[PDB]
Structure formats: structure tokens, C-alpha cells
């Protein structure tokens, strides 16, 4: 987790949480886009910056632009 087991590093399967995942898929829904309203909202229940939730999504698609 630290040294002691901690090796692989670029797999991340799915640690992340089922709230954070939670404001993610709310907007998917509707909220296709992200805007100043829903990033700063989303942002105050997330605990996240404007621009790292907005980031979030913009680097995804990128990874998918670009292919591998």
C-alpha cells in the first residue's frame, strides 16, 4: 500500500468511491456538457475544484481522441 505491497500503479481498476462515481453518472444523464453552474454545484458536494471536475471529463474524452 505504501512499499510493501505497493508496486503497480497504472492499473486502477476501481478505487474509487460510490459518491464520487454518484455527481459523475447524475450529469451524464442530462448534463452531458459541464458549465459553470454544474461544475461549481458538483463541485461543493464532490469536494472538488471547477476545473478538476470539468478537467475530469475533457481528459477522458482525449484518451479517447488521440486512441492509444
Given amino acids: 500500500a505504501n512499499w510493501i505491497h505497493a508496486r ?20 451524464f444523464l442530462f448534463n452531458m456538457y459541464l458549465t459553470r453552474d454544474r461544475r461549481y454545484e458538483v463541485a461543493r458536494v464532490l469536494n472538488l475544484t471547477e476545473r478538476q471536475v470539468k478537467i475530469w471529463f475533457q481528459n477522458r474524452r482525449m484518451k479517447m481522441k488521440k486512441m492509444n
Fill in 8 to 27: 503497480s500503479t497504472r492499473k486502477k481498476r476501481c478505487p474509487y468511491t460510490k459518491y464520487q462515481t454518484l455527481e459523475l453518472e447524475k450529469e
